[PDB]
Ligand binder design. Sequence first.
Ligand SMILES: *C/C=C(C)/C=C/C1=C(C)CCCC1(C)C
Length: 137
Amino acid sequence: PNFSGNWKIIRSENFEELLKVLGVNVMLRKIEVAAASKPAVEIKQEGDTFYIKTSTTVRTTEINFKVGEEFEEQTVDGRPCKSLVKWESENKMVCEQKLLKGEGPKTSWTLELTNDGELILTMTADDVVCTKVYVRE
Ligand SMILES: *C/C=C(C)/C=C/C1=C(C)CCCC1(C)C
């Protein structure tokens, strides 16, 4: 199995709560939920090298990384971080995020495949766990 595809969302839990537990105010949460609550996910995987694009009608975000090599991106509440992805187990990867400036509650994300070929995204912030589920288009 592998992660490449244009993945369509079928479930999304607790995205706004991830923002709220990080202290993002209601104004800013409305803007983030409107732009990114239920994005499509496009992945191009070549072994350990990844391109991932999340998109809605109004916002696209793209990252490029290789497992085991540091890269820069932003946390879900918009703070710059340095990220590092590792395989937790076969076809489950976990991204550790370290803030570039100051401190804050821990954030992470995970992408994994189920035995039937669904893609499960987990995002964490403090004690909140957001789950999004996708199938290939
Ligand atoms: C609602 C979920 C997101 C907006 C997740 C975003 C995201 C990125 C912007 C980088 C690819 C990793 C991933 C966590 C899928």
